[PDB]
Design a protein around this ligand. Structure first.
Ligand SMILES: Nc1nc2c(ncn2[C@@H]2O[C@H](COP(=O)(O)OP(=O)(O)O)[C@@H](O)[C@H]2O)c(=O)[nH]1
Lengths: 222, 571
């Protein structure tokens, strides 16, 4: 069911020789070689001018760094992955994420839609993209970074019962409306929505709502 | 007062989402008297910028991996060493801790780290790995944020950047390409050429080149050579580096020999030679503007630096006045013009000390506060003069007239001829009083105010000494009323002239203020003109390069940006 060592080298030496000019596939192979043998949990393929990663990544790793490359689409990811580092690439859409993932670094890409989000996600950064609407928001997910984007709504999807949360960022967007699902959260949340063109009546509807005994309300910043 | 840093210290740290300036780095900053040549070496993760900084100072024949046992997760490092080729100046080295979410993310605020290195530096060094390309001009997106990151002037934008931005230096790591036609400077100019067109991909790829061209006055490029072992990490070896740097050390020793003899001293608006405390107020006012939620402006930073050095220039001006008057004022003053002339002379030097140590006193509030404190010093010096004059003329009375206060107490002058012999002795005592030297200004008042208090005894001698006619022939007691009337007149006639002389000085002082401030504001407009002429000669230097290299589309928008300056130079 899993691949073998000789199976990995064959498909990698093949992927090595389809080398675009300047593309440092020769070093990435000697790293993927070095990765598989010691069974190390970390795979670092950053700043190698890579436009397409091979379909066979060592399914034993848990940390993947392929940021600062020309990646267009990403291959299937090992279920054993914890952290995902792929920023400042040309990604268009994401393969379905492993259910064991915890962090997601995808900022500075060309994403417009997102696949399902595992509940094991604790932090992520999705800024500098072109997404409008978003899929399920996990329960333990606390640190969102969606500053630079085209989003117009924020359907904060619920789970079993979400305890204490952390700061979310939605500045510089086109939200233009706050659903009361925001206001339902208690006074331990942080929601930054600066530089978003808001509704006229809703501009002052939240001003007079927060300048009150609004002890049962989340902190809003704009 | 020499300084040679013992290992690069953190200046500002990028921690937990914001910036928190390292106080120990600011403490050693405030101790640097000499001016600074600040060279900022910025770079992404592991961009090989360490072997530059550790060479720009000259640690050894290479430095052993810098210091990785203390990798403070931060945004900027500093290293201040004495400048080798410029004698009195201090060579400051800046560096980024490494951007790109290496061990922690938070690169959210990376665009500030770039802009901060621009404002703080006099020579800007940017380290990338070879063959400036599409993937490189994408990682340099920080230069695209500058148009919205900072501002030149403040409102109660990007055009003025070329006036004060440092010189862009691009160090190409591990490139050394043998691309036969070019020279490294010709490559940086060939790479900076644009693509004519009206598409969104033309503008999105010509935009980062327009920024690096329009914003920076001078541009110089350098390259690296990269030892032949393609797998070796930070190997500590200098003889294995001599076998690994044939034309590499020749590139780095030439790059440092250029930075040493061609990097300008850090300056601000008005020829302000930036030094330790000035740089300290710079970094402090910039990060505190960021963390407070505002954009950093170079005008507000140089005004906040003005509010610091202007009030300090007032104290040095006040203190120089006190030192002068203490060694000049010979109390009690003989006249009043003697004191007022000794004041305006030491007042002139006090204004001179303030002028040379002040800059852009907004509305001259710091100069008028000095003149208000100087007028207070003017007043109490006359009041201490009156106290000094009176306290001596009074002691003269207790020694000249106290013998006569006993001759009358003993009964003399109460006999035939007693009155005319008392007056004759009083005419003599009043003469010895007037003959005593250095009495002061209160000599006339204290004498008369004492005679009008002893007039009861001058009267009691009358009607006691018959001697001759009296009793309706008391001409010499209405004569006494005549003297105590003309005396109380010339005293009031001098209280006028005294109060007149104080208004003469309240104008000769104000005329000295408007005279020295005139020469300062004159040389202020003279410098600004030269600064604008250089700024204009460089905005025309880049418009001609767009007409020369084809693009008349941008030369017209450059003429639009230049004609905006022409109207703002006027008022
Ligand atoms: N590619 C390259 N790397 C170098 C060179 N010199 C030193 N290095 C490596 O680059 C690392 C230092 O990178 P640096 O500029 O400090 O990046 P930072 O650590 O993220 O701040 C060290 O581990 C060195 O081993 C060079 O000439 N070329």
């Amino acid at each position: 069911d899993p691949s073998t060592y000789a199976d990995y080298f064959s498909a990698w030496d093949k992927w090595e020789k389809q080398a675009l000019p300047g593309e440092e596939r020769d070093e990435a192979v000697s790293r993927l070689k070095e990765c598989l043998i010691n069974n190390s949990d970390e795979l670092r393929l950053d700043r190698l001018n890579l436009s397409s990663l091979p379909d066979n990544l060592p399914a034993q790793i848990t940390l993947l760094n392929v940021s600062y490359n020309q990646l267009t689409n990403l291959p299937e990811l090992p279920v054993t992955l914890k952290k995902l580092y792929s920023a400042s690439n040309k990604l268009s859409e994401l393969p379905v994420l492993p259910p064991a993932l915890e962090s997601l670094q995808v900022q500075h890409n060309e994403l417009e839609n997102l696949p399902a989000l595992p509940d094991s996600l604790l932090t992520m950064n999705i800024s500098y993209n072109e997404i409008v609407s978003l899929p399920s928001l996990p329960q333990a997910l606390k640190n969102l970074r969606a500053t630079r984007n085209f989003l117009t709504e924020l359907p904060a999807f619920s789970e079993g019962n979400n305890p204490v949360v952390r700061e979310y960022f939605f500045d510089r967007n086109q939200i233009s409306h706050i659903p009361e699902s925001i206001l339902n959260l208690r006074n331990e949340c942080s929601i930054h929505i600066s530089d978003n063109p808001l509704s006229s009546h809703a501009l002052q509807a939240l001003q007079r709502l927060t300048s009150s005994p609004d002890y049962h309300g989340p902190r809003i910043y704009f | 007062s020499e300084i040679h840093m013992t290992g690069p210290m953190c200046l500002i740290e990028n921690t937990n989402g914001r910036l928190m300036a390292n106080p120990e780095a600011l403490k050693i900053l405030s101790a640097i008297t000499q001016p600074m040549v600040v060279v900022a070496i910025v770079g992404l993760y592991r961009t090989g910028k360490s072997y530059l900084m550790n060479k720009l100072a000259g640690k050894k024949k290479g430095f052993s991996l810098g210091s990785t046992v203390q990798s403070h997760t931060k945004g900027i490092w500093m290293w201040c060493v004495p400048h080798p080729k410029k004698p009195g100046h201090i060579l400051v080295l800046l560096d980024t801790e490494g951007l790109g979410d290496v061990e922690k993310g938070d690169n959210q605020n990376d665009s500030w780290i770039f802009a901060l290195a621009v404002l703080l530096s006099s020579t800007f060094v940017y380290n990338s790995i070879g063959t400036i390309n599409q993937q490189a001009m994408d990682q340099l997106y920080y230069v695209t944020e500058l148009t919205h990151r900072i501002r030149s002037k403040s409102s109660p934008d990007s055009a003025d950047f070329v006036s004060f931005f440092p010189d862009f230096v691009w160090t190409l790591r591990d490139f050394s390409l043998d691309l036969e036609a070019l020279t490294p400077d010709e490559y940086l100019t060939y790479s900076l050429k644009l693509k004519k067109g009206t598409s969104q991909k033309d503008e999105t790829f010509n935009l980062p080149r327009l920024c690096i061209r329009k914003f920076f006055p001078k541009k110089k490029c350098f390259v690296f050579d990269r030892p032949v072992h393609r797998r070796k990490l930070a190997q500590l070896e200098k003889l294995q580096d001599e076998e690994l740097d044939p034309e590499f050390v020749q590139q780095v020793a030439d790059f440092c020999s250029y930075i040493f003899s061609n990097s300008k001293t850090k300056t601000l608006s008005g020829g302000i030679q930036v030094n330790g405390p000035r740089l300290e107020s710079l970094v402090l006012t910039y990060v505190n503007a960021i963390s407070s939620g505002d954009l950093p402006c170079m005008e507000n930073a140089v005004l906040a630096l003005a509010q610091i050095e202007n009030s300090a220039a007032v104290q040095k001006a006040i203190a120089h006045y006190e030192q002068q008057m203490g060694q000049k004022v010979q109390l009690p003053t003989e006249t009043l013009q003697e004191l007022l002339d000794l004041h305006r002379d030491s007042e002139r030097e006090a204004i001179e000390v303030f002028i040379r140590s002040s800059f852009k006193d907004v509305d001259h509030l710091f100069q008028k506060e000095l003149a208000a404190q100087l007028e207070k010093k003017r007043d109490d010096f006359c009041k201490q003069n009156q106290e000094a004059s009176s306290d001596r003329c009074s002691a003269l009375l207790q020694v000249i007239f106290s013998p006569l206060e006993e001759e009358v107490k003993a009964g003399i002058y109460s006999k035939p001829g007693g009155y005319r012999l008392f007056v004759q002795k009083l005419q003599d005592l009043k003469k010895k009083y007037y003959e005593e030297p250095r009495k002061g200004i209160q000599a006339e008042e204290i004498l008369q105010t004492y005679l009008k208090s002893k007039e009861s005894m001058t009267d009691a001698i009358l009607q006691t000494d018959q001697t001759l006619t009296e009793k309706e022939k008391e001409i010499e007691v209405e004569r006494v009323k005549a003297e105590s009337a003309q005396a109380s007149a010339k005293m009031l006639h001098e209280m006028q002239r005294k109060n007149e002389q104080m208004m003469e000085q309240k104008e000769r002082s104000y005329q000295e203020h408007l005279k020295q401030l005139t020469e300062k504001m004159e040389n202020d407009r003279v410098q600004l003109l030269k600064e604008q002429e250089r700024t204009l000669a460089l905005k025309l230097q880049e418009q001609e390069q767009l007409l020369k290299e084809g693009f008349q589309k941008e030369s017209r928008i450059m003429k639009n940006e230049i004609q905006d300056l022409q109207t703002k130079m006027r008022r």
